[PDB]
Enzyme design. Structure first.
Site, PDB file in Angstrom:
ATOM      1  N   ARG A   1       0.806  -1.189   0.000  1.00 54.96           N
ATOM      2  CA  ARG A   1       0.000   0.000   0.000  1.00 54.96           C
ATOM      3  C   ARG A   1       0.855   1.261   0.000  1.00 54.96           C
ATOM      4  O   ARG A   1       1.723   1.437   0.849  1.00 54.96           O
ATOM      5  CB  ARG A   1      -0.865   0.003   1.241  1.00 54.96           C
ATOM      6  CG  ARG A   1      -1.734   1.232   1.407  1.00 54.96           C
ATOM      7  CD  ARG A   1      -2.817   0.963   2.423  1.00 54.96           C
ATOM      8  NE  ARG A   1      -3.443   2.194   2.865  1.00 54.96           N
ATOM      9  CZ  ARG A   1      -3.113   2.840   3.975  1.00 54.96           C
ATOM     10  NH1 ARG A   1      -2.145   2.378   4.768  1.00 54.96           N
ATOM     11  NH2 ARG A   1      -3.726   3.969   4.285  1.00 54.96           N
TER      12      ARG A   1
ATOM     13  N   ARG B   1      -9.208  17.909   9.522  1.00 52.52           N
ATOM     14  CA  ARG B   1      -8.546  17.813  10.811  1.00 52.52           C
ATOM     15  C   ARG B   1      -8.307  19.176  11.457  1.00 52.52           C
ATOM     16  O   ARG B   1      -8.551  20.210  10.845  1.00 52.52           O
ATOM     17  CB  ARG B   1      -7.247  17.007  10.698  1.00 52.52           C
ATOM     18  CG  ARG B   1      -6.325  17.398   9.551  1.00 52.52           C
ATOM     19  CD  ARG B   1      -5.066  16.498   9.492  1.00 52.52           C
ATOM     20  NE  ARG B   1      -5.403  15.071   9.277  1.00 52.52           N
ATOM     21  CZ  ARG B   1      -5.438  14.133  10.232  1.00 52.52           C
ATOM     22  NH1 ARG B   1      -5.133  14.427  11.496  1.00 52.52           N
ATOM     23  NH2 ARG B   1      -5.800  12.894   9.928  1.00 52.52           N
TER      24      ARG B   1
ATOM     25  N   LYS C   1     -13.297   2.428   0.166  1.00 49.96           N
ATOM     26  CA  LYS C   1     -13.035   2.290   1.588  1.00 49.96           C
ATOM     27  C   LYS C   1     -14.258   2.640   2.387  1.00 49.96           C
ATOM     28  O   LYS C   1     -14.772   3.758   2.300  1.00 49.96           O
ATOM     29  CB  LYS C   1     -11.888   3.168   2.011  1.00 49.96           C
ATOM     30  CG  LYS C   1     -10.574   2.749   1.405  1.00 49.96           C
ATOM     31  CD  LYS C   1      -9.530   3.828   1.586  1.00 49.96           C
ATOM     32  CE  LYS C   1      -9.170   3.983   3.054  1.00 49.96           C
ATOM     33  NZ  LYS C   1      -7.741   4.287   3.188  1.00 49.96           N
TER      34      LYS C   1
ATOM     35  N   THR D   1      -7.232  -1.591   9.607  1.00 53.25           N
ATOM     36  CA  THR D   1      -7.239  -0.835  10.878  1.00 53.25           C
ATOM     37  C   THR D   1      -7.717  -1.672  12.065  1.00 53.25           C
ATOM     38  O   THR D   1      -8.377  -2.698  11.901  1.00 53.25           O
ATOM     39  CB  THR D   1      -8.061   0.491  10.801  1.00 53.25           C
ATOM     40  OG1 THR D   1      -9.462   0.235  10.816  1.00 53.25           O
ATOM     41  CG2 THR D   1      -7.740   1.241   9.592  1.00 53.25           C
TER      42      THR D   1
END
Lengths: 472, 473, 378, 473
Positions: free
Chosen positions: B34, B75, B219, B277
């Protein structure tokens, strides 16, 4: 889609008239039976060829079946013509020559004296009259009548329980077999089969003449049903002779023996024919009894590959009507239910797993036909016993096999060249099927066949396609 | 099971840049590498990319390369002190304007936050460890109240469950990164922040402009994705279950059921599914995982997953090899113990589907040593892989790109071969290729699934059972 | 309402005035007395506080005495004293530590039969030798407890989650209850809220098929004992309110008692029954239905109050006390009476009852009866 | 299978009037005695009726009594000569007027023949042995042409396929016979010439006027009946497949399939089915049947039939005992060989149905020695019987009439007991009744199906498994 179950017809006096063998074929005859208990070799030659011409003309496959007589065990002649054996009377049946007399008459079975022992039962005319052996005094078998009734020239004699010592093939049969093999018949049926070893004696003769065909064991005696499995394995097919089984077995056991034999045959991919007492009333009538139609229908429902007509076509007055009626019954049973008795043998071997898988795939995808390539028939016979409602199209290079597959359930056969490549084999299937008005481009078909052509792994390939999907 | 079947994805970063380390991963089991485009400049990627390709050639093992697109960067900005503490009940302002960070007021990277936020929306910070609620928008400022307190620092993630977020699924930055990755030669692309099946089209626009398509992995990070799970699995080529992110924005107890449901959905449609994850995150700092982590991994395997993914464990951790070895050892352990994985419920109705099931049956019933599938795009192999048959699954393809793409598909090794001219020659090729590797020998039974006459209009339509070299002389 | 059961450990942290009662109200189903800590007097006082709380709230609460355990015999000299004390004190179950062999239960049974009082014995799966004999142990003991922390000391860490699943399965196949213990919410010893990793871990125990989950230091020494129980409850509920089913059982029922339990469930499900009612004298009949994790409410009726405490640790089971039954027809009339006193169900609602032939029959469970509530009310 | 399951119906006539012969039948296996009201005056029936009841009491065996109603008498009148010959192509007149018989002209018993017949309708004579066709109706004369030739005599049957026959299902004569039989105390009534489900209502009118109902059996003799097979099986209580009669009016090849279809249809609806006509007709003159007959019988058994019926074999034959012994021996042989019967498709949906199936399962799974079913009307037992379970099937009832009525139902023996006071008492009764038989002993496992508390509103709702005298002292 059309009739699946096959029809065997017996040829005789009644089928010698103008274009009558052809009329049978057109009405549905799939196998023609030549019965070697009757006729001269010349009558057979002429019938044989009339079938082959009819088969060519109509385009329909027609197998030819040579029925061997086996031991001729019957009464001699009476000077009177007939007599009456009433209960309690003593009577002498002799292996010598004599004139027909109430008290003493000859039998055709020369060994009767050496084989009979105090106690053995002797049944006459399909068990209508019954005797019991008291002693053997030289050539005479001295008997007492247990069940009385009229008796005449040349009536059948059955010897249940008796250790009969005739071989399964008489000297006369070997001549008939030899004749039939040279004549070109496609199968041979053996009467009076008692043991799986009995096939060997037919094979001796075939290998001497250098030509083998499928051998059908006729299930006529208790000893046959005692060895049912070993016989079905050693022979290539079986014929359930219910009349004859009914003479020597408990009458209530017979319907279960029929079912059991048919099942046994299907489990082992052998053809089974159901014969005797089918539509016997149609020897004299243009229509059958209700009881007969029901009986036939239950043979079909039992799972039978083919049903057989005997006197109905060989001597009767309504031979065509008999075949048409047998057809109409078979159709009616089939049009009504797909379902036939399930099989219990789980397939374990490459060729077996594939045959089942092909059927599944075909049925699941709604295929219009199931095409099987075969050199001996084995691969097609494995699919036929499943009674799948998919048309079942055999493709073979050996033309003999087309005739042999005439007696196998639901199967039409096409003759094609030896295949050069797998891709060529697919192209052949398209070509052959498109010739028929039945199929057109776009129809889905499942093919079962051999890895690379003439491979050591026999059947090992399943291929699904629509006809002419790659043509432009 | 004769090998590891489940596949392993590893993330490349700082930790995998030193001497022969990419190669060490591959040798330990990495199947897909990845490339995470939220970190690194394009030169760091070029150098990693090539190290993978060399490793793949050297070892002989297929290794896919996966380009992960960032999606919307949402963020916190920076704090002047470096961090603060937002305690429950306090009012705090998160602003789309530039400012230096204070307790009362800090900026966000997400410029649209003001126009998107509405009274009531929840604003979660640092993997949902702190939660706020918007009271109103006064200009620049989204004025919030702290519902769950805790420390916050520079550049912590913000999740906006429920909020009508208006960023597109592909940022301007993503388009640059996608374009770069496509030309660089990557084998798949993963899109973050997927909310609708339509989101794939925006990736396809870019692919078709550059003139190169690869499989696109959605995703599953957001609730709206799970709301459209079926439509997404159909429109995309694969899915990735992002457990951490789903756990922030859905009830935590719902996540294990969403994982199972997504994996099931993928398998029913012959799409690959990756589980990512919350795998072995403790191994960023430790040579061994927590029991809870081992259990988590094992449940992903048992749930039916095509591949499992390592993130920081390999990209920044101190034990990248151990992480891959451990993930492998767990996957193996689960597999060596039970064949059984969740049954599929789709009854196959189509020619290609009926054949894939039939081939598996035949193979298993006859105790075949391997199941060989010819394929141009992977479709035929992926239809067998989702069955989780314990037969080795060998893909044969003329397109080499596909070998890399099938790296993320369950239980699958791929062989690259020439274009076939005839069906009988295709069988001869299968023998030739299998015999090269001293795993198969003459006499071993194999099942082949393939195409009628070569380049036929009916795609896969043939099943063929043979023992190797049964006809040679 | 919650189906899975919660075990809580009593210690220093639960000695505050009316704190035990606060636990029970928050959901405690079984109270664990750990005999590696405390004097006999601390236990006596905890024991009684549980019983008063159980009476007050109306909720069943089992009391599980945990023999410390200790090559060593199965029971230390100290354990025999603790067991004897606990048996006389009136506990409803005993858990044995350091179990290695199915024979280990016999040493506990020797002591029970000397004192003349038997209760269920729970084998704690703590050692490799236990997992080596998993099936023989599950058969010889009356229940099992998966101690994952302890298993994690001597076993490969990655193998433990599969051993947990395997033991839970094994227990359910044999109608024994299974408790999952250790490393549940240990963070809440010091914190008012657990780590995400812990909540996920608990949820996986639930999903694995567990009858009950256990709190240890969280309640015995922690500073947030109530919050711990409330949180475990809230998680168990949340997991349950989602997932339909539990891992399927594969053991084919062959015995009279077993065939009937399965048939009852089938009949219940086929007819859309609102509940599954079991009469029981010893618990066995209820335990056979509980392991199925059927979504039907499961209502046990027993005359023996000890059994109501023992059934507290079985999945999805509420147990009511009724009188000793005089006749089968009377027993059906009692079920109607009790069910209307709950007023939970309605006029034409179906329930399925499983019970004993004539009352106190030698055939144990052998009767299925389907009826509507107030169907014989003219 | 532990004993004969399939049941035997025997017809009473001249041949069964001699010394202790009704009793000899019962001992040989007769389960139902048929009283055929096409022959005998009411006094002959009274004497037969009582002989059966005495025999039933003496032997202990249940024996039902079945009143067969004639329906429309449709046949030739008398010929002056006694017989004639109708050869093909000849014209002949069948008249509803009185005349003595000549070749050219003879009367019929069916008075409506003139009003019903129209140009084209076919007239079949003597079981279809001779066929005619109507050219016209000229007053009272139905003028016909012979299509199929053959001999004809006094009082031969005529069938009118296709013709719109307008007789009601119950003649005036039948109503008298039904009334007689109902008062006499028969257990069932069979109606001939049934064509529609409404036909049962005319029997029910009479039953309700006299104030006594018994099961009504529809005889399937006509095509219109098979056209309404399902509606008829639902409206009547049982059916009788008359194959001979169906064979004259239907395609002969269709009859075997109609038999199977009717038997299946009856079992799906828990109605008894009898198979009649042409069973062992050869045994009217012979001490042994034809092979074709034995095969036919065996196929009726295998088709799933509750009972098989003897007609002339017992009513006029010379070997009445041998006929019933032989029918028994065949039925047994088929049964001893396979317990498999055609599967049903009826899924049970109702409380009482789900319980009956569950009880059977439990019984079979636990290898029970018997399945005991408590019943007020038979319904509960008939629902288990149609399953053809190999468990003995023991009905327990307080109504003695039901024991006789269950004589025609498959595999069922019935015990008559007192009204039950309590469920526990009902278990004690089962033990008591079964222990009288040397067949059952203490310790044998049985399954009981029954009512909640005795006289409960919820019908069957209880399954109870016990070993006999397990709580005994």
């Amino acid at each position: 889609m059309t009739r699946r179950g096959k029809i065997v017809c017996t040829l005789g006096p009644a089928t010698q008239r103008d274009d009558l063998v052809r009329a049978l074929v057109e009405a549905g005859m799939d196998v023609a039976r030549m019965n070697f208990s009757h006729g001269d070799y010349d009558d057979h030659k002429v019938a044989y060829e009339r079938v082959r011409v009819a088969s060519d003309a109509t385009g329909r496959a027609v197998g030819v079946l040579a029925d061997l007589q086996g031991p001729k065990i019957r009464l001699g002649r009476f000077a009177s013509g007939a007599t009456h054996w009433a209960e309690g009377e003593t009577v002498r049946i002799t292996v010598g020559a004599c004139e027909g007399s109430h008290d003493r008459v000859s039998t055709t079975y020369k060994r009767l004296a050496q084989d009979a022992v105090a106690g053995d039962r002797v049944l006459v005319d399909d068990g209508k009259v019954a005797l019991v052996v008291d002693a053997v005094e030289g050539d005479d078998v001295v008997c007492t009548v247990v069940e009385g009734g009229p008796v005449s020239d040349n009536k059948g004699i059955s010897l249940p329980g008796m250790n009969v010592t005739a071989p399964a093939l008489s000297e006369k049969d070997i001549e008939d077999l030899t004749f039939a093999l040279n004549l070109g018949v496609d199968m041979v049926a053996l009467s009076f089969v008692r043991s799986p070893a009995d096939v060997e004696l037919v094979h001796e003769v075939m290998d001497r003449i250098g030509r083998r065909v499928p051998v059908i064991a006729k299930l006529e005696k208790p000893e046959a049903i005692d060895n049912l499995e070993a016989i079905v394995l050693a022979f290539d097919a079986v014929m359930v002779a219910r009349g004859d089984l009914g003479v020597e077995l408990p009458l209530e056991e017979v319907p279960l023996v029929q079912k059991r034999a048919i099942q046994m045959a299907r489990e082992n991919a052998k053809p089974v024919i159901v014969a005797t007492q089918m539509l016997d009333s149609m020897i004299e009538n243009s229509r059958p009894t209700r009881a007969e139609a029901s009986d036939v229908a239950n043979a079909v429902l039992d799972g039978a590959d083919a049903l057989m007509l005997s006197g109905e076509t060989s001597v009767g007055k309504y031979p065509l009507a008999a075949v048409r009626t047998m057809s109409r019954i078979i159709c009616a049973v089939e049009e009504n239910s797909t379902a036939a008795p399930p099989l219990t043998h789980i397939p374990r071997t490459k060729r077996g797993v594939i045959s089942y898988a092909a059927r599944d795939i075909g049925e699941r995808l709604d295929a219009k036909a199931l095409v099987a390539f075969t050199q001996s028939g084995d691969t097609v016979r494995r699919l036929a016993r499943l009674h799948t409602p998919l048309p079942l199209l055999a493709f073979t290079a050996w033309p003999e096999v087309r005739s042999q597959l005439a007696m196998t359930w639901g199967t039409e056969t096409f003759i094609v060249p030896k295949m050069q490549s797998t891709d060529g084999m697919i192209r052949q299937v398209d070509k052959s099927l498109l010739e028929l008005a039945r199929y057109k481009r776009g129809d889905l078909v499942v093919i079962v066949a051999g890895a690379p052509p003439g491979t050591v792994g026999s059947t090992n390939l399943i291929h699904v396609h629509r006809i002419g999907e790659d043509d432009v």
